[PDB]
Amino acid sequence: SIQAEEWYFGKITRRESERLLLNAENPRGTFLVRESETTKGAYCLSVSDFDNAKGLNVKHYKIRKLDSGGFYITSRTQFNSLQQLVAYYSKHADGLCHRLTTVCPT
Ligand SMILES: O=P(O)(O)[C@H](O)c1cccc2ccccc12
């Protein structure tokens, strides 16, 4: 759980996530989950996007974790695990820049 997850990069900075995601070869939705730099207990979901307006770019979303157990970006849409959250957002874009597609290559 989490650390076993290949999309879990653990303790890497926001800048490092952008370095990895800003690769021209990455299609929209390339992603990774990492620790937040300053929000304790929260993780960050970093996602690549692309459009003709900005071109290749990166968005960061905070994944909150309750002691009650749930994981969520928006409190209205919660999951029993980080894994289920990733699987859901791989199917639904909802408010994200793109549905999660491919785990970010190192
Ligand atoms: O700096 P990170 O790691 O991206 C971090 O989780 C973060 C992202 C976006 C806004 C933030 C605001 C406050 C504290 C941390 C924040």
From Swiss-Prot:
Superkingdom, natural source: Eukaryota
Localization terms from the record: Cell membrane; Mitochondrion inner membrane; Nucleus; Cytoplasm, Cytoskeleton
Domain SH2, first and last residues per copy: 7-104
Tissue specificity as recorded in UniProt: Expressed ubiquitously. Expressed in the skin (at protein level). Platelets, neurons and osteoclasts express 5-fold to 200-fold higher levels than most other tissues.
PTMs per UniProt: The phosphorylated form is termed pp60c-src.
Phosphotyrosine carried by residues: Y43
Job of this protein: Non-receptor protein tyrosine kinase which is activated following engagement of many different classes of cellular receptors including immune response receptors, integrins and other adhesion receptors, receptor protein tyrosine kinases, G protein-coupled receptors as well as cytokine receptors. Participates in signaling pathways that control a diverse spectrum of biological activities including gene transcription, immune response, cell adhesion, cell cycle progression, apoptosis, migration, and transformation.
Noted disease: SRC kinase activity has been shown to be increased in several tumor tissues and tumor cell lines such as colon carcinoma cells. Thrombocytopenia 6: A form of thrombocytopenia, a hematologic disorder defined by a decrease in the number of platelets in circulating blood, resulting in the potential for increased bleeding and decreased ability for clotting. THC6 is an autosomal dominant form. Affected individuals may also have bone abnormalities and an increased risk for myelofibrosis.
Other notes: May be involved in blister formation in Pemphigus vulgaris, phosphorylated-SRC is abundant at blister sites but not in normally adherent tissue, which corresponds with loss and disruption of CDH1 in cells adjacent to blisters. Phosphorylated SRC is increasingly abundant at pre-lesional sites of blister formation and occurs prior to changes in abundance of CDH1 and DSG3.
Family per record: Belongs to the protein kinase superfamily. Tyr protein kinase family. SRC subfamily.
Domains as described in the record: The SH2 and SH3 domains are important for the intramolecular and intermolecular interactions that regulate catalytic activity, localization, and substrate recruitment.
Quaternary structure annotation from Swiss-Prot or TrEMBL: Part of a complex comprised of PTPRA, BCAR1, BCAR3 (via SH2 domain) and SRC; the formation of the complex is dependent on integrin mediated-tyrosine phosphorylation of PTPRA. Interacts with DDEF1/ASAP1; via the SH3 domain. Interacts with CCPG1. Identified in a complex containing FGFR4, NCAM1, CDH2, PLCG1, FRS2, SRC, SHC1, GAP43 and CTTN. Interacts with ERBB2, STAT1 and PNN. Interacts with DDR1, DDR2 and DAB2. Interacts with CDCP1, TGFB1I1 and TOM1L2. Interacts with the cytoplasmic domain of MUC1, phosphorylates it and increases binding of MUC1 with beta-catenin. (Microbial infection) Interacts with HEV ORF3 protein; via the SH3 domain.
Protein name: Proto-oncogene tyrosine-protein kinase Src
Taxonomic source organism: Homo sapiens (Human)
